[PDB]
Design an enzyme around this catalytic site. Structure first.
Site, PDB file in Angstrom:
ATOM      1  N   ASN A 107       0.831  -1.088  -0.071  1.00 52.99           N
ATOM      2  CA  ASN A 107      -0.037  -0.031   0.034  1.00 52.99           C
ATOM      3  C   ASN A 107       1.067   1.394   0.007  1.00 52.99           C
ATOM      4  O   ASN A 107       2.144   1.368   0.552  1.00 52.99           O
ATOM      5  CB  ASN A 107      -0.937  -0.199   1.302  1.00 52.99           C
ATOM      6  CG  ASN A 107      -1.820  -1.251   1.339  1.00 52.99           C
ATOM      7  OD1 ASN A 107      -2.325  -1.928   0.119  1.00 52.99           O
ATOM      8  ND2 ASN A 107      -2.367  -1.541   2.481  1.00 52.99           N
ATOM      9  N   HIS A 126       6.060  -0.425  -2.663  1.00 56.50           N
ATOM     10  CA  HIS A 126       5.556   0.197  -3.518  1.00 56.50           C
ATOM     11  C   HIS A 126       5.996   1.596  -3.460  1.00 56.50           C
ATOM     12  O   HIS A 126       5.415   2.617  -4.082  1.00 56.50           O
ATOM     13  CB  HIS A 126       4.148   0.069  -3.904  1.00 56.50           C
ATOM     14  CG  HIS A 126       3.634  -1.361  -4.585  1.00 56.50           C
ATOM     15  ND1 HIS A 126       4.675  -2.157  -5.126  1.00 56.50           N
ATOM     16  CD2 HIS A 126       2.575  -2.113  -4.355  1.00 56.50           C
ATOM     17  CE1 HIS A 126       4.105  -3.214  -5.481  1.00 56.50           C
ATOM     18  NE2 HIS A 126       2.778  -3.061  -5.022  1.00 56.50           N
ATOM     19  N   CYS A 161      19.469  22.039  -7.021  1.00 57.16           N
ATOM     20  CA  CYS A 161      19.424  21.949  -8.344  1.00 57.16           C
ATOM     21  C   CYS A 161      18.285  22.452  -9.026  1.00 57.16           C
ATOM     22  O   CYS A 161      18.322  22.801 -10.435  1.00 57.16           O
ATOM     23  CB  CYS A 161      19.972  20.542  -8.835  1.00 57.16           C
ATOM     24  SG  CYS A 161      18.456  19.478  -9.049  1.00 57.16           S
ATOM     25  N   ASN A 222      -7.983 -12.898   4.562  1.00 58.58           N
ATOM     26  CA  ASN A 222      -8.334 -12.320   3.334  1.00 58.58           C
ATOM     27  C   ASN A 222      -9.767 -12.921   2.856  1.00 58.58           C
ATOM     28  O   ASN A 222     -10.383 -13.543   3.301  1.00 58.58           O
ATOM     29  CB  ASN A 222      -7.463 -12.714   2.002  1.00 58.58           C
ATOM     30  CG  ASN A 222      -7.418 -12.072   0.821  1.00 58.58           C
ATOM     31  OD1 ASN A 222      -7.185 -11.039   0.635  1.00 58.58           O
ATOM     32  ND2 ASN A 222      -7.657 -13.153  -0.156  1.00 58.58           N
TER      33      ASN A 222
END
Ligand code: BBI
Ligand code: ZN
Length: 272
Positions: A107, A126, A161, A222
Site C-alpha cells: 500500500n 511500492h 539544483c 483475506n
C-alpha cells in the site's frame, strides 16, 4: 491442522516472536482508500480535471509532462488525511510487544507509519510519501520537507539544483526499493507469516509466501483462499476468510488484546 485460535495461542505464548507480515489493499479500503474508479472526491479532481488513462498517474513520462495529477494524489494521501483502522493498530500492538520482525506493505497510504510503526520495521515495497527524491540530482528529503508545497498545490523543487522533487512512490517500470532486499534475511528468520488483505498473486510477493521454512505457520486473513496459499497449501496454513476487519478483530479477541486495542485507538485518535 491449525485454527485461528491455535495461531493466537502461539503468539500469546511467544512461541512465534519473529512475525513477518505482508499486507495489501484489503487493509486500507476500510479506512476509505481505493485499491491502486468513478464517484469519489479524488476521482472528481483527477480523473476528471486531468488524467488521460488511470495508470498515467504512475508513469514517469507523464509525470514529467504534467506532475499535477500525481501531486493531487499526494495531497489527498499525505499523512493526516486518513486514519489507520483496527488492522493497522493490530500490527502496531504486535510491534509494541516485540513480536514484529518486519511488515511488508503493498500500500502507499502510509497508514502503517501513521499508526506508529517505525520505518525500520517497514518495507514499503511500492514506495512511500514519507520520503522524496530530486528527480535530477537524486538528493533525498524527508516527506515533511515538501509538505507545505504539496498542501499548497505547488510542485516541490530541489533547493540545490531546482529539479522536481518527487515522492518516493514506485512508478511503472521502476525497480522495487532497496529495502525490499531485506526479504533475503527476513523470510528465513520468520517463525510466523501473516498475510492481510491480499492474496499475493503477483510476483515477486507470490514467491515470497514460499520463502518461509516449512514448519512456519502461514495465516491468511483475506476475502478468499486464492493465490499461492491456495495453489500450494502447507500443513500449518490457516485461512480466516470473509471480512478482513472482522478477521483481525476476531484474532485480537483471541489474543486477549481487545481492551488494550480500545485504549491504543483512543490515545491515538486523541493525538491525530
Ligand atoms: C516488480 C513488481 C512491481 C510492483 C508495482 O510497481 C507499480 C507501479 C505503479 C503501479 C503499480 C505497481 C506495482 C504493482 O502494484 C503491481 C505490479 C505488477 I508487475 C502487477 O502485475 C499485474 C499482474 N498481471 C499478471 C497476472 C495481471 C494479472 C500488478 I496487478 C501490480
Ligand atoms: Zn536536485
Amino acid at each position: 491442522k491449525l485454527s485461528l485460535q491455535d495461531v493466537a495461542e502461539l503468539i500469546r505464548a511467544r512461541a512465534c516472536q519473529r512475525v513477518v507480515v505482508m499486507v495489501g489493499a484489503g487493509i486500507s479500503t476500510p479506512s476509505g482508500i481505493p485499491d491502486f474508479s468513478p464517484g469519489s472526491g479524488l476521482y472528481s479532481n483527477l480523473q476528471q480535471y486531468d488524467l488521460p488513462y488511470p495508470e498515467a498517474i504512475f508513469e514517469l513520462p507523464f509525470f514529467f509532462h504534467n506532475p499535477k495529477p500525481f501531486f493531487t494524489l499526494a495531497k489527498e494521501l499525505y499523512p493526516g488525511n486518513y486514519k489507520p483502522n483496527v488492522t493497522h493498530y493490530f500490527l502496531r500492538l504486535l510491534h509494541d510487544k516485540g513480536l514484529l520482525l518486519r511488515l511488508y506493505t503493498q500500500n502507499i497510504d502510509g497508514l502503517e507509519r501513521v499508526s506508529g510503526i517505525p520505518a525500520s520495521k517497514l518495507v514499503e515495497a511500492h514506495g512511500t510519501f514519507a520520503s522524496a527524491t530530486c528527480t535530477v540530482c537524486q538528493r533525498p528529503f524527508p516527506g515533511e520537507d515538501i509538505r507545505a508545497d504539496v498542501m499548497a498545490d505547488r510542485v516541490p523543487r530541489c533547493p540545490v539544483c531546482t529539479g522536481v522533487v518527487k515522492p518516493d512512490i514506485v512508478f511503472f517500470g521502476e525497480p522495487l526499493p532497496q529495502r525490499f532486499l531485506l526479504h533475503v534475511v527476513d523470510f528465513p528468520m520468520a517463525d510466523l507469516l501473516l498475510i492481510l488483505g491480499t492474496s499475493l498473486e503477483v510476483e515477486p510477493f507470490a514467491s515470497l509466501t514460499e520463502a518461509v521454512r516449512s514448519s512456519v505457520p502461514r495465516l491468511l486473513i483475506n476475502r478468499d483462499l486464492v493465490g499461492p496459499l491456495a495453489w500450494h497449501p502447507r500443513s500449518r496454513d490457516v485461512a480466516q476468510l470473509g471480512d478482513v476487519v472482522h478477521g483481525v478483530e476476531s484474532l485480537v479477541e483471541l489474543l486477549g488484546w481487545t481492551e488494550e486495542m480500545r485504549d491504543l485507538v483512543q490515545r491515538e485518535t486523541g493525538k491525530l
